[PDB]
Amino acid sequence: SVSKANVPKIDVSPLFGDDQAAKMRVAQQIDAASRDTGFFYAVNHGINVQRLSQKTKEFHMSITPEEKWDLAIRAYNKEHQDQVRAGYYLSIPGKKAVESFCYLNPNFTPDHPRIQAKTPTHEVNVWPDETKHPGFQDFAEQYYWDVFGLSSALLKGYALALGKEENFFARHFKPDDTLASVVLIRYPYLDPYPEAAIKTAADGTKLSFEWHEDVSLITVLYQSNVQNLQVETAAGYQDIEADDTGYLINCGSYMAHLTNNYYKAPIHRVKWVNAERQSLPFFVNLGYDSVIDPFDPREPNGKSDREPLSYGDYLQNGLVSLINKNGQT
Numbered sequence: 269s270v271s272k273a274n275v276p277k278i279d280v281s282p283l284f285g286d287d288q289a290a291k292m293r294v295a296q297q298i299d300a301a302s303r304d305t306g307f308f309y310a311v312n313h314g315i316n317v318q319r320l321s322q323k324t325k326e327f328h329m330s331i332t333p334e335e336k337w338d339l340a341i342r343a344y345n346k347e348h349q350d351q352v353r354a355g356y357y358l359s360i361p362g363k364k365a366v367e368s369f370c371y372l373n374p375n376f377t378p379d380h381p382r383i384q385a386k387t388p389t390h391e392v393n394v395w396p397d398e399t400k401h402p403g404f405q406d407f408a409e410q411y412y413w414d415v416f417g418l419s420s421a422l423l424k425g426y427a428l429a430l431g432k433e434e435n436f437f438a439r440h441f442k443p444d445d446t447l448a449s450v451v452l453i454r455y456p457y458l459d460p461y462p463e464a465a466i467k468t469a470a471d472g473t474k475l476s477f478e479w480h481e482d483v484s485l486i487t488v489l490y491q492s493n494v495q496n497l498q499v500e501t502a503a504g505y506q507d508i509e510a511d512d513t514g515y516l517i518n519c520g521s522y523m524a525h526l527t528n529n530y531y532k533a534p535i536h537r538v539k540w541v542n543a544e545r546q547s548l549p550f551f552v553n554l555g556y557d558s559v560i561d562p563f564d565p566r567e568p569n570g571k572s573d574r575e576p577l578s579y580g581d582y583l584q585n586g587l588v589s590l591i592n593k594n595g596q597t
């Protein structure tokens with residue numbers, strides 16, 4: 269009934285290297301995908317995703333109810349007032365099926381200047397007990413740096429794509445201060461699956477999460493090989509095919525702002541599927557004070573009628589609004 273979205277597979281491996289011409293050919297593919305459905309799969313990305321899925325599986329299946337309250341964000345545990353972003357997002361059996369664990373920059377330590385200042389959107393990660401989840405924290409922190417690496421490469425391709433030098437975005441994306449996050453989302457198999465956990469789209473499609481744009485510069489997403497995502501195009505919502513060997517890449521609304529909608533943030537939603545699966549996004553966020561002057565690559569002088577917006581401002585408003593629009597996750 270629903271047709272397949274154009275989601276090209278792009279070999280992003282020249283973005284790690286020093287062959288400048290070959291990086292420009294990748295840039296072009298990124299430009300094309302970004303002007304069309306707004307999604308592509310990055311292939312030859314160098315990350316061991318089957319291990320990521322295994323380590324993440326072992327965590328989700330072995331965390332206990334007790335641990336979840338102990339790690340819970342403020343929205344679920346009012347004792348944990350500093351936990352706005354990072355920690356455990358509980359399901360509600362009978363009502364909200366999905367659950368997840370979010371963590372931030374491992375460099376956000378108690379001595380970090382932004383943590384000392386108590387700056388919004390900066391928090392110190394919470395972790396389960398090492399003896400109960402041996403290896404998990406070190407694996408997860410390592411994953412953050414491996415996906416950080418991929419995202420830097422990708423941001424070099426988007427820079428080149430937009431007619432900029434390759435460091436245009438990446439110079440704002442730094443280990444010591446990035447607001448980027450990993451979310452380890454568990455979608456369960458449930459029998460019976462509670463209707464209260466299923467939303468219905470205007471067109472009748474059963475959904476786990478409604479239409480939205482991403483709160484990010486770009487999103488770098490690993491998921492299981494279970495089809496679920498749809499993207500709105502001028503021909504209506506189209507199905508994004510699953511590929512659990514690549515990363516699904518799209519632009520968030522920060523990119524749309526900077527480029528004056530030359531690279532739109534694609535509107536997408538998550539169909540309801542009764543399957544035990546994973547969705548493991550990395551939201552590529554810049555630094556709290558990062559400001560890029562907005563521009564327009566469709567205009568001869570490159571000038572835009574949008575005003576500069578600091579990443580920190582964008583992020584804190586965005587994440588609130590997303591909760592308001594689509595509910596607490």
Ligand SMILES: CSC[C@H](OC(=O)[C@H](CS)NC(=O)CCC[C@H](N)C(=O)O)C(=O)O
Pocket residue numbers: 353354366368370448449451453476477480482483538547551587590597
């Ligand atoms: C967990 S609800 C459904 C899930 O959607 C999301 O994670 C949505 C849309 S991309 N994103 C968010 O809720 C933002 C999480 C931001 C994160 N907690 C942070 O602090 O960075 C999905 O796409 O499967």
Ligand SMILES: [Fe+2]
Pocket residue numbers: 480481482536
């Ligand atoms: Fe999304």
